[PDB]
CSV table of C-alpha atoms in Angstrom, one decimal:
chain,number,residue,atom,x,y,z
A,1,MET,CA,46.2,79.7,37.6
A,2,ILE,CA,46.0,76.8,35.1
A,3,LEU,CA,44.5,77.2,31.6
A,4,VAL,CA,43.9,74.3,28.9
A,5,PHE,CA,43.5,75.6,25.4
A,6,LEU,CA,41.8,73.4,22.8
A,7,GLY,CA,40.7,73.6,19.2
A,8,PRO,CA,41.4,72.1,15.7
A,9,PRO,CA,44.6,72.7,13.6
A,10,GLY,CA,43.9,76.4,11.8
A,11,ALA,CA,42.2,77.7,14.9
A,12,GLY,CA,45.4,79.7,15.9
A,13,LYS,CA,45.2,78.7,19.7
A,14,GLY,CA,49.0,78.9,20.0
A,15,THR,CA,49.3,82.3,19.0
A,16,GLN,CA,47.0,83.4,21.9
A,17,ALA,CA,48.7,81.0,24.4
A,18,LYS,CA,52.1,82.8,23.6
A,19,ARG,CA,50.7,86.3,23.9
A,20,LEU,CA,48.8,85.5,27.0
A,21,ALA,CA,52.0,83.7,28.2
A,22,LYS,CA,53.9,86.7,27.8
A,23,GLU,CA,51.7,89.3,29.3
A,24,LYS,CA,50.5,87.6,32.2
A,25,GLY,CA,53.7,85.6,33.0
A,26,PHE,CA,52.5,81.8,32.2
A,27,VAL,CA,54.7,78.8,31.4
A,28,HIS,CA,53.5,77.8,28.0
A,29,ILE,CA,53.5,73.9,27.9
A,30,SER,CA,53.6,71.6,24.9
A,31,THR,CA,53.7,68.1,25.8
A,32,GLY,CA,55.8,67.6,22.5
A,33,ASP,CA,58.7,69.7,24.0
A,34,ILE,CA,58.8,68.2,27.2
A,35,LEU,CA,58.8,64.4,25.9
A,36,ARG,CA,61.4,65.3,23.1
A,37,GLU,CA,63.6,66.7,26.0
A,38,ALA,CA,63.0,63.9,28.4
A,39,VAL,CA,64.0,61.2,25.8
A,40,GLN,CA,67.1,63.3,24.3
A,41,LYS,CA,68.5,63.7,28.0
A,42,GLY,CA,67.9,60.0,28.7
A,43,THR,CA,66.2,60.4,32.0
A,44,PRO,CA,64.5,57.3,33.6
A,45,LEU,CA,61.1,58.2,32.1
A,46,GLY,CA,62.8,59.6,28.9
A,47,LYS,CA,64.3,56.0,28.6
A,48,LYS,CA,60.9,54.3,29.2
A,49,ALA,CA,58.7,56.6,26.7
A,50,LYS,CA,61.5,55.9,24.1
A,51,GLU,CA,61.2,52.0,24.2
A,52,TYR,CA,57.5,52.6,23.7
A,53,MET,CA,57.9,54.7,20.3
A,54,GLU,CA,60.7,52.3,19.0
A,55,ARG,CA,58.1,49.4,19.0
A,56,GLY,CA,55.4,51.3,17.3
A,57,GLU,CA,53.2,52.0,20.3
A,58,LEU,CA,52.1,55.2,21.6
A,59,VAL,CA,53.5,56.4,24.9
A,60,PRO,CA,51.2,55.5,27.7
A,61,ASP,CA,49.1,58.4,29.3
A,62,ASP,CA,50.6,57.6,32.9
A,63,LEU,CA,54.2,58.3,31.3
A,64,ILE,CA,53.3,61.7,29.9
A,65,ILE,CA,51.6,62.7,33.1
A,66,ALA,CA,54.7,61.9,35.1
A,67,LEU,CA,56.7,63.9,32.7
A,68,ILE,CA,54.8,67.0,32.9
A,69,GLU,CA,54.7,66.4,36.8
A,70,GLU,CA,58.4,66.5,36.8
A,71,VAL,CA,59.0,70.0,35.2
A,72,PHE,CA,56.0,71.7,36.3
A,73,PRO,CA,56.6,75.0,37.4
A,74,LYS,CA,56.4,75.7,41.3
A,75,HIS,CA,54.4,79.1,41.1
A,76,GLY,CA,51.6,76.7,39.3
A,77,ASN,CA,50.9,79.4,36.4
A,78,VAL,CA,50.8,77.4,33.3
A,79,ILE,CA,49.0,77.2,30.0
A,80,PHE,CA,48.2,73.6,28.5
A,81,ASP,CA,48.5,74.2,24.8
A,82,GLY,CA,46.4,71.0,22.9
A,83,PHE,CA,46.8,68.8,26.1
A,84,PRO,CA,44.9,66.7,27.2
A,85,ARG,CA,43.7,65.1,24.0
A,86,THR,CA,41.3,62.5,25.7
A,87,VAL,CA,39.2,62.0,28.4
A,88,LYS,CA,41.5,59.8,30.1
A,89,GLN,CA,44.3,62.2,29.9
A,90,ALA,CA,41.7,64.9,31.5
A,91,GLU,CA,41.1,62.5,34.5
A,92,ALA,CA,45.1,61.8,35.1
A,93,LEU,CA,46.0,65.3,34.7
A,94,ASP,CA,43.1,66.5,37.2
A,95,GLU,CA,44.2,63.6,39.6
A,96,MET,CA,47.9,64.8,39.4
A,97,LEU,CA,47.1,68.5,39.9
A,98,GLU,CA,44.8,68.0,43.1
A,99,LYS,CA,47.8,66.1,44.5
A,100,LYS,CA,49.5,69.5,44.6
A,101,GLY,CA,46.2,71.3,45.7
A,102,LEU,CA,45.5,72.8,42.3
A,103,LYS,CA,42.9,72.5,39.6
A,104,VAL,CA,42.3,73.5,35.8
A,105,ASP,CA,40.4,76.9,36.2
A,106,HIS,CA,39.4,77.5,32.5
A,107,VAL,CA,39.3,75.5,29.6
A,108,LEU,CA,39.3,77.6,26.5
A,109,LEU,CA,37.7,76.0,23.3
A,110,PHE,CA,38.5,77.6,20.0
A,111,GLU,CA,35.5,77.2,17.9
A,112,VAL,CA,35.9,77.9,14.2
A,113,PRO,CA,33.7,76.7,11.1
A,114,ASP,CA,35.0,73.6,9.3
A,115,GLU,CA,34.6,76.0,6.3
A,116,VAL,CA,37.2,78.3,7.6
A,117,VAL,CA,39.6,75.6,8.6
A,118,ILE,CA,39.2,73.9,5.2
A,119,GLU,CA,40.0,77.5,3.5
A,120,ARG,CA,43.3,78.0,5.9
A,121,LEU,CA,44.8,74.5,5.6
A,122,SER,CA,43.7,73.5,1.9
A,123,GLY,CA,45.1,76.7,0.4
A,124,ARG,CA,48.7,76.2,1.4
A,125,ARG,CA,51.4,75.5,-1.1
A,126,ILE,CA,54.8,74.3,-0.9
A,127,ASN,CA,57.9,75.1,-2.7
A,128,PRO,CA,59.7,71.9,-2.8
A,129,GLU,CA,63.0,73.4,-3.6
A,130,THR,CA,63.1,75.4,-0.2
A,131,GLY,CA,60.4,74.2,1.8
A,132,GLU,CA,58.9,78.0,1.7
A,133,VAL,CA,55.2,77.8,2.5
A,134,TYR,CA,52.8,80.0,0.5
A,135,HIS,CA,49.0,80.2,0.3
A,136,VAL,CA,46.8,80.7,-3.0
A,137,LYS,CA,44.6,83.0,-1.3
A,138,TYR,CA,46.5,84.8,1.6
A,139,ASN,CA,50.2,85.0,0.4
A,140,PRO,CA,50.2,83.7,-3.4
A,141,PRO,CA,53.9,82.5,-4.6
A,142,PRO,CA,55.1,84.5,-7.7
A,143,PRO,CA,53.6,83.3,-11.0
A,144,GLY,CA,56.5,81.4,-12.0
A,145,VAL,CA,57.8,79.6,-9.0
A,146,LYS,CA,57.0,76.0,-8.8
A,147,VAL,CA,54.7,75.1,-5.9
A,148,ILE,CA,52.6,72.1,-5.0
A,149,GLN,CA,49.9,71.0,-2.6
A,150,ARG,CA,50.5,68.5,0.1
A,151,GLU,CA,48.2,65.6,-0.2
A,152,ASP,CA,47.1,66.2,3.4
A,153,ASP,CA,45.8,69.7,2.4
A,154,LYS,CA,43.4,68.5,-0.1
A,155,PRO,CA,39.7,69.5,1.2
A,156,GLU,CA,38.7,65.9,1.3
A,157,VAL,CA,41.7,64.9,3.6
A,158,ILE,CA,40.9,67.9,5.8
A,159,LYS,CA,37.2,67.1,6.2
A,160,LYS,CA,38.1,63.5,7.3
A,161,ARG,CA,40.7,65.1,9.7
A,162,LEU,CA,38.2,67.5,11.4
A,163,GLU,CA,36.0,64.5,11.7
A,164,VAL,CA,38.5,62.5,13.5
A,165,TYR,CA,39.6,65.6,15.7
A,166,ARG,CA,35.7,65.8,16.8
A,167,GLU,CA,35.2,62.1,17.4
A,168,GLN,CA,38.3,62.2,19.8
A,169,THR,CA,37.3,65.8,21.4
A,170,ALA,CA,33.6,65.6,22.0
A,171,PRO,CA,33.8,63.6,25.2
A,172,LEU,CA,36.8,65.9,26.4
A,173,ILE,CA,34.5,68.9,26.1
A,174,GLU,CA,31.6,67.2,27.7
A,175,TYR,CA,33.6,66.3,30.6
A,176,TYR,CA,34.7,69.9,31.0
A,177,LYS,CA,31.3,71.0,30.5
A,178,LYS,CA,30.4,68.9,33.3
A,179,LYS,CA,32.7,70.6,35.7
A,180,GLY,CA,31.5,74.1,34.6
A,181,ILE,CA,34.9,75.3,33.2
A,182,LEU,CA,34.6,75.3,29.6
A,183,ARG,CA,34.7,78.6,27.9
A,184,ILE,CA,33.8,79.0,24.4
A,185,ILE,CA,35.9,81.1,22.2
A,186,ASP,CA,34.6,82.5,19.0
A,187,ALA,CA,37.9,81.9,16.8
A,188,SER,CA,36.7,82.9,13.5
A,189,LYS,CA,37.1,86.7,14.6
A,190,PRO,CA,40.0,89.2,13.8
A,191,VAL,CA,43.2,88.1,16.2
A,192,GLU,CA,43.0,91.3,18.3
A,193,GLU,CA,39.0,90.4,19.0
A,194,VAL,CA,39.9,86.7,19.9
A,195,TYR,CA,42.4,87.8,22.4
A,196,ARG,CA,39.5,90.2,23.8
A,197,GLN,CA,37.5,87.0,24.4
A,198,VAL,CA,40.3,85.2,26.2
A,199,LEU,CA,40.8,88.2,28.4
A,200,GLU,CA,37.6,88.3,29.2
A,201,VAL,CA,37.1,84.9,30.4
A,202,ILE,CA,40.2,84.9,32.8
């Protein structure tokens, strides 16, 4: 079966993805990985994707689709983690899948209140003399170790970032809602209870 896992950063969706992959025997797919490998190996699509990045352009959607179609497991059990990102990608993904007589079975939307995402992300502190990460609330640094707060983790910026995430994702969500395949997960819950919801929907 094929699953898509979507959610903003801070939602913990990849932890859920990796556990399910391990227990059930899915291939976990991050498009970042497949792209990086193709570009490094210098395959024909790897080379084409590369020219685009060098110019300052996004890699076109049909290229990412073709990269996925290349390394796609024969058994057809995969979890897409954070992809598609747009409606356009969703349409092209659907198209290449049905070319194999396969479909997306479930899309899991990991929902979590803005308030909680801000607390998770904004709380982060970095030792710039190692790069070792801490959290003012969850895992405080020793009083004494020098730590900073990345500009990006300021509540202002994160707020902006969720707003952009929603603008981009709303139409994706609606597209999957229209097909009757969107399952809502309450990701505000303890990790074991989130995993319970995922198992329930599948």
